[PDB]
Design a protein around this ligand. Structure first.
Ligand SMILES: NC(=O)c1ccc[n+]([C@@H]2O[C@H](COP(=O)([O-])OP(=O)(O)OC[C@H]3O[C@@H](n4cnc5c(N)ncnc54)[C@H](O)[C@@H]3O)[C@@H](O)[C@H]2O)c1
Ligand SMILES: NC(=O)c1ccc[n+]([C@@H]2O[C@H](COP(=O)([O-])OP(=O)(O)OC[C@H]3O[C@@H](n4cnc5c(N)ncnc54)[C@H](O)[C@@H]3O)[C@@H](O)[C@H]2O)c1
Ligand SMILES: C[C@@H]1O[C@H](OP(=O)(O)OP(=O)(O)OC[C@H]2O[C@@H](n3cnc4c(=O)[nH]c(N)nc43)[C@H](O)[C@@H]2O)[C@@H](O)[C@H](O)[C@@H]1O
Ligand SMILES: C[C@@H]1O[C@H](OP(=O)(O)OP(=O)(O)OC[C@H]2O[C@@H](n3cnc4c(=O)[nH]c(N)nc43)[C@H](O)[C@@H]2O)[C@@H](O)[C@H](O)[C@@H]1O
Lengths: 316, 316
């Protein structure tokens, strides 16, 4: 089966690429290398089952070309950074709504049979139902990013129904692990790289979120892809997160523990009642019962995932 | 209070404009007249409280100017035609997501406190729960149009939370009445103008939908707007439709009745099981309990509204 993996040079994208290549898929990657890295996939450069394309999905010619002779598309290309939503909503609109729109228009005029899209928990915004099921609503995202992911979901479904392809929407929790160049663990480790004595923590440290290690993330993505191929649903929605959650302050504590530092915590106090930023959901914990009915389940919890991530990262 | 009404030269927009002028609002209209007409609002030209701006919302300067010195925005500008979704998805993308995105970017740099958006039942797609409540989900629109409307909703919510304005999203059912230049009644009347002996009905004729007369529609929009001004929700969702529904075949029968014709109905059999087109939802009926708790209620049911619309149209 031939698959396009947009953003396949990214953190999650390159791991999905490793998995797909190892299972014998013929994998093309489409990535402008604005945030991913060629190194993250240099092992596959030169494999006869691997093709790489440096390309911006804003460019429709590129996107029509990349989906040509592809049976499945895994659309992971995006700017995932919620932080930049209050300064750079245009960037989030483009790299979430626009490039997905172009991908779908390309998909319409091709033989692409399956579209797997990595949406986010942020579509629920500050969800009042915990653990949050996939049918929670009304969806009132509080960040430009979550709104852009919701819009991507909507357009994916509409094109799937109108132009007769199948679509699998996977709302991911916080995903952490080796090769990640963004997030709170990364930033804590590098802040302490620059100064071991203090840790500037955005917000009040009480933000509690579900963290999944990238290993469980890819196992679950593949399990859902497997089940979805065997299923009949035109469009299917799954949450993908861990069973529990952990606070920003506890994450700072684990990162300090693993770095053998004991710095002075300095919280910025946040906004909208201690959020790290405008649109930073304070509580997130996804109901993964629907995902677990496929056989998947995380082998690590949020605390284990965070600690393993810190270790893996400090090796590099 | 000064309010902008984008698309205010349209069917629903021009009636909303009439209403706003009569209640003493200061009304600016922004409309490129791609589907509306100056006739529909030329009656107000020369009033000290009325300003009209001919402009396409794709142009960001136009929209930035229009929200200048406006306290509330009624964003009715769009292409509402679902039928063209499989032919012209780019057009729906532009006139639903793009110009909504531009309006929102304009609103961020303004003093607009309230944004009211005319969403559609199509966001629910083929809803499996009927009457469909505002919290039905997962939202899986089956049309490019419904997907674009949902994406617009998402961006509205995200920007409302991020940049501190409030948003009222009103999911309208099928709206019918004077000045309507689209829909099934319009097309059936013109079909029988060209040939009174026969009527081509798209689909299998069993499509059952909730119709609201434009009078009830504007009464409800104003009730909801006032109540929303009195409420605390940063973003609030309301259905706006009738209590009942009616099939396309009964609408054909009523149109024949009022035209004193009795033609031969010829149903085209449709697609995807008798739909009028790719992405045409077959059954629609929104739960209006939430709308009715504001005091609003339709004075006409679907059959009365359809008959009133046909009569009004035939006077012209
Ligand atoms: N990391 C998480 O915690 C997390 C959580 C939930 C959802 N997700 C989603 O999973 C997916 C993968 O995220 P990630 O952590 O691997 O991020 P990433 O930025 O590391 O990977 C995304 C890739 O997209 C590429 N890209 C950016 N703009 C592009 C464009 N215009 N055209 C082509 N390629 C472009 C980047 O260069 C990068 O290689 C995204 O959809 C993200 O929103 C991530
Ligand atoms: N008619 C219905 O049954 C119905 C149902 C649900 C929702 N809605 C929504 O209500 C609103 C009004 O629909 P309507 O029936 O009055 O349609 P309409 O076309 O009569 O009115 C929409 C207006 O948008 C204007 N417009 C179109 N493209 C524009 C652009 N690029 N820039 C600026 N203005 C532009 C048109 O000229 C028109 O005046 C729309 O948002 C529509 O999607 C309508
Ligand atoms: C659900 C996922 O959310 C992901 O964002 P997101 O949760 O903020 O994930 P992070 O950026 O890791 O931030 C997680 C939490 O840690 C807080 N935090 C505290 N200090 C810091 C710091 O120094 N840096 C950062 N970055 N955070 C910090 C942050 O505000 C939030 O409460 C997205 O990247 C994905 O695309 C996806 O949307
Ligand atoms: C909910 C609202 O739905 C509205 O569309 P939508 O339901 O198709 O409303 P109409 O365009 O009126 O079509 C209503 C039903 O009548 C069918 N139909 C049968 N024959 C005809 C015909 O000759 N012409 C037309 N036009 N329809 C016909 C049509 O496919 C559908 O099943 C949108 O205009 C609004 O923006 C909003 O989305």
């Amino acid at each position: 089966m031939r698959v396009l993996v947009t953003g396949g040079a990214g953190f999650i994208g390159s791991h999905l690429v490793d998995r797909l290549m190892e299972e014998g898929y013929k994998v093309r990657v489409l990535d402008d290398l604005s945030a991913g890295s060629l190194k993250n996939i240099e092992g596959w450069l030169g494999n006869e089952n691997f093709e790489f394309i440096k390309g911006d999905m804003r460019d429709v010619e590129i996107v029509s070309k990349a989906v040509k002779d592809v049976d499945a598309v895994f659309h992971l290309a995006a700017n995932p950074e919620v932080r930049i939503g209050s300064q750079s909503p245009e960037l989030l609109y483009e790299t979430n709504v626009l490039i997905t729109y172009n991908l779908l228009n390309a998909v319409r005029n091709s033989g692409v049979k399956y579209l797997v899209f990595t949406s986010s928990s942020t579509v629920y915004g500050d969800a009042k139902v915990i653990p949050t099921p996939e049918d929670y609503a009304p969806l009132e995202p509080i960040s430009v990013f979550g709104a852009a992911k919701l819009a991507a979901e909507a357009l994916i479904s509409g094109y799937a129904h109108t132009f007769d392809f199948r679509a699998l929407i996977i709302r991911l929790a916080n995903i952490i692990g080796k090769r990640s160049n963004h997030g709170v663990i990364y930033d804590f480790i590098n802040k302490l790289k620059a100064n071991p004595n203090e840790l500037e923590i955005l917000g009040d440290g009480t933000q509690r979120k579900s963290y999944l290690h990238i290993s469980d993330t890819i196992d679950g993505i593949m399990k859902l892809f497997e089940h979805f191929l065997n299923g009949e649903e035109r469009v299917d929605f799954y949450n993908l997160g861990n069973e529990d959650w952990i606070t920003v302050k506890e994450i700072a504590e684990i990162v300090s523990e693993e770095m053998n530092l004991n710095p002075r915590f300095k919280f910025t106090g946040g906004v909208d009642g201690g959020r790290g930023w405008k649109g930073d959901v304070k509580l997130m914990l996804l109901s993964i019962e629907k995902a677990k009915r496929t056989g998947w389940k995380p082998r690590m919890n949020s605390y284990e995932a965070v600690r393993k991530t810190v270790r893996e990262m400090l090796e590099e």
